[PDB]
Amino acid sequence: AMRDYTKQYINGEWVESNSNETIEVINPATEEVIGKVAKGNKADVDKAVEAADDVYLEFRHTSVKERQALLDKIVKEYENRKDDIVQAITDELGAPLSLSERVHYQMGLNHFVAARDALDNYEFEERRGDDLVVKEAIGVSGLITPWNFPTNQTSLKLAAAFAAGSPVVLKPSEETPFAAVILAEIFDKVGVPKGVFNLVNGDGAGVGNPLSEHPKVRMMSFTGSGPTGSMEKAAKDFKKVSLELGGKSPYIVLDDVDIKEAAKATTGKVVNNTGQVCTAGTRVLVPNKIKDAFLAELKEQFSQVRVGNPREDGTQVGPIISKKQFDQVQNYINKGIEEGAELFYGGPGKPEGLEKGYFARPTIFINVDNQMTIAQEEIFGPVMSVITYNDLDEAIQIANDTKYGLAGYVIGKDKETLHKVARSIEAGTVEINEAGGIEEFLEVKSIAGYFK
Amino acid sequence: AMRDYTKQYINGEWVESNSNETIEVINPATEEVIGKVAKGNKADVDKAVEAADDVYLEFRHTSVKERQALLDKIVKEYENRKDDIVQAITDELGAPLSLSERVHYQMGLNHFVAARDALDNYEFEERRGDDLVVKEAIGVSGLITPWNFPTNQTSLKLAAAFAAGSPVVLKPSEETPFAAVILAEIFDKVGVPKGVFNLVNGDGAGVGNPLSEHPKVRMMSFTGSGPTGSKIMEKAAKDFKKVSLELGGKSPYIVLDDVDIKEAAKATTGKVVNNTGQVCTAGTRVLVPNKIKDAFLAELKEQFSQVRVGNPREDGTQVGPIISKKQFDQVQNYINKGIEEGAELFYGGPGKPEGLEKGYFARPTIFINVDNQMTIAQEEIFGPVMSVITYNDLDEAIQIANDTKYGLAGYVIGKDKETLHKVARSIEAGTVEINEAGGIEEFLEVKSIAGYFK
Ligand SMILES: [Mg+2]
């Protein structure tokens, strides 16, 4: 049941790419080719950007009620596509079937519902004295989205842009294009106006680069790796840029913790989505006194992690997304071993019986010095680095020495200690004890003397 | 007398620069050098950034009433320095004395007042369910400020950073460092804690580049030219610093056919000549209806004659000189480019006015029969040069008004209210002005702690 996706969605219809080349989409679990998309070029981008540019004033000044109605149609049709979306995510990403529906599918639906509902009370116009302040769509927006959560960032940005009235040109990851294609089918069926949504498949060089360079794109929203994030080509055109960051996130374990619970929680942060999450708990800070006991429970917990085929019942962890990505995970593991980090559990290679498909082994390094490569750099795989600490201020100092500011975690009993740690960690998000966007597309204009 | 400003203000004291070299500051009106500042280097920057880095955690967590009282001390001392500030601005910028007092000085004062007052009630902490959401100072922030309003962007950013609890490293324009030096004196006198404010004078290569590239600077705030802006924002792409760029533009002024001709000429002339046309929001493109064209130009010729260009310290001078020789030449190059392209010279022209050959003085200049595709239509001149573009139907006017690379400002002057509203709403700009009618968040970032109260 091969999928031929090679057409691009531009100006209200599916059209053949200007490029004669295609990109094979691979199932990370079986290594087999499940379909293909266009390997897109500048010509595709230019055609799509022009189509967006032609409609941007029309979309901007579309009434809020009208845009909300469109979002409702999208909500309905998205639900109609539920099984198609779950199957696609499982196939292309390698996510277990249960997580495909309850996490990946649900995320997308939530973003669209939230955007539609926000338009009930959102104020695009405010009177101050004799002056009127308005908020309007920024206009044509480029979107480059990650593979790790193909429905997440994609649905979020599209829902926001549609709510705002900004038309878009989307390049999904060539690694996981299928969910984006379905969204395009959805948009086409509910009839989002011609030019408002455009889908151009391809890679960074063929598509990503020209899109970020296009003079008629007023806004650029990117999600992905650090180097590609470097924003340099959008500084020439002075595009508004939304950064998305990788991270090495510390998980600090207090010495008063229930050890089994800490082991469960930290394992979960590392193992989830095969460890490819930007917020993952890959650096675990443990007290010396409870170190041996914690490691013992940790080893136990890892052995019970279920790594295998996503379509098979019970699978917790699927494969790594791609050969290239799988290789990077292996190299980082090998590098930690070269550094003299003691390998506690797992390590390089594939699990027995899993030799087909890219399957990383959940891996624990212990006695890690924070200056080590596996400590400093983002692996994007199920690799945990355990770092011991004697006192709390030391743990904080370690947790805070990183290039990344993305996320942090702490688990323990004593409240003030938990609060001291949480407040001390410098990150946008800190989570204690496993506790369970439209502005971006808008511009503010003040009209002076409107009323007088 | 000659000001020796060659000392940097770093780590709570006036210190000798690590550099052995200096930069001369010139009076735009007299062409003489009125003083010197350090030509700063990477070493000065690193010392300043480290001094800020050492204190940033403490300043972030200092209390609201503490920062507010600091700003209040600043407000008071800023008022004490009023004459010094006015003289300095006039000397270094070339702004007329009355404008330096009424506009430049006042702007800075208002900024510190607004920031102080805003802290009266501002919510840095909000509980949501069992989660805590806090707004905290982003930490060490670099500031690079322009010469066209030396006390404006400087005071605005400094007040915001102080209100937020972010320490700063400031590099002022080496064209207009004096106002910034005075601010430093004020901050030192009222006892802004050491490391919180740092002044490093120099140019783009010695100071601006190392500052923008510094791994310990978490935020960069820049106001100035486009070319430099792209340059600095590109250097901030490696560290993924938060960047705020504020840039110039070509702002259309749309005149309706029902307007009063004299007041139209009065309004449009004012928007062009103010601050010798160096304003980012300047009204440099003037769109006039084809029917009132001849009558408008005649009154426009009359209004420009009433514009007094000359010595800033001379009583009644409306318009001073251009800031610098380099910038004066740029204005000249644009005026010539207009002639070269076939734009019709109406009033003014290239060269200095008769009677000032000394100082950099551009003649207020009107071009008519201008096509919007011309260079003088499409590019910011930063001088008192007006391009008059006629239109037939209002749809054409909006089209021309919105064909520019800039989104900065727009103006419409007329009578019919529905027409004014439509034009105002149609112009793409951040600020639109109908009939000549009359922050801290930048330095804060949000941190959510999940299950804080759980
Ligand atoms: Mg000067």
From Swiss-Prot, chain A:
Q: Does the keyword NAD apply?
A: yes
Q: Which Pfam families match?
A: Aldedh (PF00171)
Top EC category: oxidoreductase
Under which EC number(s) is this enzyme classified?
1.2.1.3
The answer to whether keyword Protein biosynthesis applies is no
The reaction(s) catalysed by this protein are: an aldehyde + NAD(+) + H2O = a carboxylate + NADH + 2 H(+)
Alphabetical keyword list: NAD, Oxidoreductase
What Gene Ontology molecular function terms does this protein carry? aldehyde dehydrogenase (NAD+) activity
An example Gene Ontology biological process: aldehyde metabolic process
Could you tell me which InterPro entries the record lists for this protein? Answer: Ald_DH/histidinol_DH, Ald_DH_C, Ald_DH_CS_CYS, Ald_DH_CS_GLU, Ald_DH_N, Aldehyde_DH_dom, Aldehyde_DH_NAD(P)
Positions bound to NAD(+): 147-148, 224-225, 245, 378
User: What assembly does the database describe for this protein?
Assistant: Homodimer.
Quote the PANTHER family the UniProt record gives.
ALDEHYDE DEHYDROGENASE, ALDEHYDE DEHYDROGENASE-RELATED
Family per UniProt? Belongs to the aldehyde dehydrogenase family.
- The protein in question is named Putative aldehyde dehydrogenase
Q: Which organism is it from?
A: Staphylococcus aureus (strain Mu50 / ATCC 700699)
